[PDB]
Amino acid sequence: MVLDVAFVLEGSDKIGEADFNRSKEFMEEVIQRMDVGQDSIHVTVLQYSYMVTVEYPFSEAQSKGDILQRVREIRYQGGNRTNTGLALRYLSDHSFLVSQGDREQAPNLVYMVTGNPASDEIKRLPGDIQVVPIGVGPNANVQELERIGWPNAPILIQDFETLPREAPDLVLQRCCS
Protein backbone atom coordinates (compact mmCIF):
# COMPACT_ATOMS: atom_id res chain seq x y z
CA MET A 1 0.00 0.00 0.00
CA VAL A 2 0.98 3.65 -0.50
CA LEU A 3 1.28 5.78 2.65
CA ASP A 4 3.43 8.60 4.00
CA VAL A 5 3.97 7.92 7.71
CA ALA A 6 5.63 10.30 10.16
CA PHE A 7 6.70 9.25 13.64
CA VAL A 8 7.27 12.15 16.02
CA LEU A 9 8.98 11.33 19.32
CA GLU A 10 9.19 13.74 22.25
CA GLY A 11 12.75 13.60 23.61
CA SER A 12 12.70 16.32 26.27
CA ASP A 13 14.22 16.19 29.78
CA LYS A 14 10.72 15.42 31.13
CA ILE A 15 10.65 12.24 29.03
CA GLY A 16 14.19 11.20 30.03
CA GLU A 17 16.54 8.74 28.32
CA ALA A 18 15.01 5.55 29.78
CA ASP A 19 11.50 6.41 28.58
CA PHE A 20 12.81 7.73 25.25
CA ASN A 21 14.44 4.33 24.63
CA ARG A 22 11.02 2.73 25.15
CA SER A 23 9.63 5.17 22.56
CA LYS A 24 12.32 3.97 20.11
CA GLU A 25 11.44 0.35 20.90
CA PHE A 26 7.76 1.11 20.20
CA MET A 27 8.63 2.74 16.88
CA GLU A 28 10.94 -0.11 15.81
CA GLU A 29 8.13 -2.60 16.43
CA VAL A 30 5.82 -0.59 14.18
CA ILE A 31 8.30 -0.05 11.33
CA GLN A 32 9.41 -3.72 11.35
CA ARG A 33 5.84 -4.84 10.57
CA MET A 34 5.15 -2.10 8.00
CA ASP A 35 5.40 -2.61 4.23
CA VAL A 36 8.17 0.00 3.91
CA GLY A 37 9.55 0.48 0.39
CA GLN A 38 10.33 3.10 -2.26
CA ASP A 39 6.99 2.46 -4.03
CA SER A 40 4.95 1.57 -0.91
CA ILE A 41 5.11 2.99 2.65
CA HIS A 42 7.48 5.91 3.27
CA VAL A 43 8.60 6.73 6.81
CA THR A 44 10.06 9.82 8.42
CA VAL A 45 11.21 10.00 12.02
CA LEU A 46 11.47 13.21 14.05
CA GLN A 47 12.67 13.77 17.58
CA TYR A 48 11.68 17.01 19.31
CA SER A 49 12.10 18.99 22.51
CA TYR A 50 13.15 22.63 22.26
CA MET A 51 14.24 22.02 18.66
CA VAL A 52 13.20 19.50 16.00
CA THR A 53 15.73 16.90 14.81
CA VAL A 54 15.16 14.99 11.56
CA GLU A 55 16.29 11.44 12.41
CA TYR A 56 15.17 9.90 9.12
CA PRO A 57 13.77 12.01 6.25
CA PHE A 58 11.24 11.00 3.59
CA SER A 59 13.84 11.99 0.96
CA GLU A 60 16.42 9.35 1.94
CA ALA A 61 16.15 5.77 0.65
CA GLN A 62 12.92 4.15 1.78
CA SER A 63 14.43 0.81 2.76
CA LYS A 64 13.33 -0.92 5.99
CA GLY A 65 16.87 -2.11 6.79
CA ASP A 66 18.40 1.36 6.49
CA ILE A 67 15.62 3.06 8.47
CA LEU A 68 15.72 0.50 11.29
CA GLN A 69 19.48 0.79 11.69
CA ARG A 70 19.19 4.60 11.81
CA VAL A 71 16.35 4.27 14.32
CA ARG A 72 18.51 2.07 16.61
CA GLU A 73 21.29 4.67 16.45
CA ILE A 74 19.03 7.60 17.48
CA ARG A 75 20.40 9.35 20.56
CA TYR A 76 18.15 10.92 23.18
CA GLN A 77 18.65 14.67 22.77
CA GLY A 78 17.01 16.00 25.95
CA GLY A 79 15.74 19.58 26.17
CA ASN A 80 13.93 21.93 28.52
CA ARG A 81 10.77 22.39 26.40
CA THR A 82 8.12 20.27 24.66
CA ASN A 83 7.68 22.32 21.47
CA THR A 84 5.00 20.10 19.93
CA GLY A 85 3.68 22.96 17.77
CA LEU A 86 7.12 23.37 16.18
CA ALA A 87 7.31 19.62 15.40
CA LEU A 88 3.86 19.74 13.75
CA ARG A 89 4.87 22.84 11.76
CA TYR A 90 7.92 20.97 10.46
CA LEU A 91 5.70 18.19 9.07
CA SER A 92 3.51 20.60 7.11
CA ASP A 93 6.32 22.92 6.01
CA HIS A 94 8.89 20.24 5.11
CA SER A 95 8.13 16.51 5.52
CA PHE A 96 4.77 16.19 3.74
CA LEU A 97 5.94 18.36 0.83
CA VAL A 98 8.39 15.62 -0.26
CA SER A 99 5.81 13.39 -2.01
CA GLN A 100 5.09 14.61 -5.55
CA GLY A 101 3.14 13.51 -8.64
CA ASP A 102 0.81 10.55 -8.09
CA ARG A 103 2.16 10.03 -4.55
CA GLU A 104 0.90 13.49 -3.50
CA GLN A 105 -2.56 11.87 -3.33
CA ALA A 106 -1.42 9.11 -0.94
CA PRO A 107 -2.67 9.34 2.65
CA ASN A 108 -0.48 11.25 5.11
CA LEU A 109 -0.36 9.87 8.66
CA VAL A 110 1.33 11.13 11.81
CA TYR A 111 2.06 8.99 14.88
CA MET A 112 3.33 11.20 17.71
CA VAL A 113 4.67 9.91 21.05
CA THR A 114 4.31 12.59 23.74
CA GLY A 115 4.12 12.61 27.55
CA ASN A 116 3.74 16.31 28.35
CA PRO A 117 1.62 19.36 27.48
CA ALA A 118 2.98 21.53 24.67
CA SER A 119 5.31 24.35 25.68
CA ASP A 120 4.42 26.35 22.58
CA GLU A 121 1.30 27.15 20.51
CA ILE A 122 -0.24 24.24 18.60
CA LYS A 123 -1.77 24.96 15.19
CA ARG A 124 -3.91 22.38 13.40
CA LEU A 125 -2.38 20.68 10.37
CA PRO A 126 -4.04 20.72 6.93
CA GLY A 127 -6.93 18.28 6.44
CA ASP A 128 -4.83 16.04 4.18
CA ILE A 129 -2.55 15.18 7.14
CA GLN A 130 -4.17 12.76 9.60
CA VAL A 131 -2.74 12.91 13.11
CA VAL A 132 -3.02 10.16 15.72
CA PRO A 133 -1.63 11.49 19.02
CA ILE A 134 -0.23 8.88 21.38
CA GLY A 135 -0.38 10.39 24.86
CA VAL A 136 1.83 8.42 27.20
CA GLY A 137 1.65 8.56 30.99
CA PRO A 138 -0.38 10.74 33.37
CA ASN A 139 1.04 14.10 32.21
CA ALA A 140 -0.28 14.03 28.64
CA ASN A 141 -2.69 16.92 28.00
CA VAL A 142 -5.80 15.04 26.81
CA GLN A 143 -7.70 18.13 25.57
CA GLU A 144 -4.67 19.32 23.59
CA LEU A 145 -4.21 15.86 22.06
CA GLU A 146 -7.91 15.62 21.16
CA ARG A 147 -7.63 19.02 19.45
CA ILE A 148 -4.57 17.98 17.37
CA GLY A 149 -6.02 14.55 16.59
CA TRP A 150 -9.58 15.44 15.53
CA PRO A 151 -11.33 13.55 13.93
CA ASN A 152 -8.93 10.87 15.23
CA ALA A 153 -9.19 9.94 18.90
CA PRO A 154 -5.84 9.97 20.71
CA ILE A 155 -4.36 6.69 21.93
CA LEU A 156 -3.73 7.06 25.66
CA ILE A 157 -1.13 4.64 26.98
CA GLN A 158 -0.47 3.85 30.65
CA ASP A 159 3.28 4.66 30.65
CA PHE A 160 6.47 4.39 28.60
CA GLU A 161 7.45 1.00 30.08
CA THR A 162 4.27 -0.55 28.62
CA LEU A 163 4.29 1.43 25.36
CA PRO A 164 6.23 -1.13 23.27
CA ARG A 165 3.96 -4.03 24.38
CA GLU A 166 0.59 -3.46 22.68
CA ALA A 167 0.61 0.06 21.21
CA PRO A 168 2.48 -1.09 18.06
CA ASP A 169 -0.51 -3.29 17.17
CA LEU A 170 -2.95 -0.41 17.79
CA VAL A 171 -0.90 1.72 15.40
CA LEU A 172 -0.61 -1.01 12.73
CA GLN A 173 -4.38 -1.60 12.94
CA ARG A 174 -5.09 2.08 12.20
CA CYS A 175 -2.54 2.54 9.38
CA CYS A 176 -2.06 -0.78 7.72
CA SER A 177 -5.05 -3.11 8.21
Ligand SMILES: *[C@@H]1O[C@H](CO)[C@@H](O[C@@H]2O[C@H](CO)[C@@H](O)[C@H](O)[C@H]2NC(C)=O)[C@H](O)[C@H]1NC(C)=O
Ligand atom coordinates in the same frame (compact mmCIF):
# COMPACT_ATOMS: atom_id res chain seq x y z
C1 LIG B 1 19.20 4.10 26.01
O1 LIG B 1 19.81 3.60 24.84
C2 LIG B 1 21.15 4.01 24.65
C3 LIG B 1 21.63 3.65 23.24
O2 LIG B 1 20.81 2.65 22.68
C4 LIG B 1 22.03 3.39 25.75
O3 LIG B 1 23.38 3.78 25.60
C5 LIG B 1 24.29 2.69 25.89
O4 LIG B 1 24.57 2.58 27.27
C6 LIG B 1 25.40 1.50 27.62
C7 LIG B 1 25.44 1.36 29.14
O5 LIG B 1 25.88 0.07 29.49
C8 LIG B 1 26.79 1.73 27.03
O6 LIG B 1 27.62 0.62 27.29
C9 LIG B 1 26.72 1.96 25.52
O7 LIG B 1 27.94 2.51 25.08
C10 LIG B 1 25.58 2.89 25.09
N1 LIG B 1 25.33 2.68 23.68
C11 LIG B 1 25.17 3.68 22.81
C12 LIG B 1 24.92 3.28 21.39
O8 LIG B 1 25.19 4.88 23.13
C13 LIG B 1 21.49 3.85 27.10
O9 LIG B 1 22.14 3.18 28.15
C14 LIG B 1 19.98 3.65 27.25
N2 LIG B 1 19.57 4.37 28.44
C15 LIG B 1 18.73 3.89 29.35
C16 LIG B 1 18.46 4.79 30.52
O10 LIG B 1 18.17 2.80 29.27
Ligand SMILES: *[C@@H]1O[C@H](CO)[C@@H](O)[C@H](O)[C@H]1NC(C)=O
Ligand atom coordinates in the same frame (compact mmCIF):
# COMPACT_ATOMS: atom_id res chain seq x y z
C1 LIG C 1 16.47 26.13 27.79
O1 LIG C 1 16.99 25.63 26.56
C2 LIG C 1 17.51 26.61 25.68
C3 LIG C 1 17.98 25.92 24.40
O2 LIG C 1 18.88 24.88 24.72
C4 LIG C 1 18.67 27.37 26.36
O3 LIG C 1 19.08 28.44 25.55
C5 LIG C 1 18.26 27.89 27.74
O4 LIG C 1 19.39 28.40 28.41
C6 LIG C 1 17.59 26.81 28.59
N1 LIG C 1 17.12 27.39 29.84
C7 LIG C 1 17.19 26.78 31.03
C8 LIG C 1 16.66 27.55 32.20
O5 LIG C 1 17.64 25.65 31.21
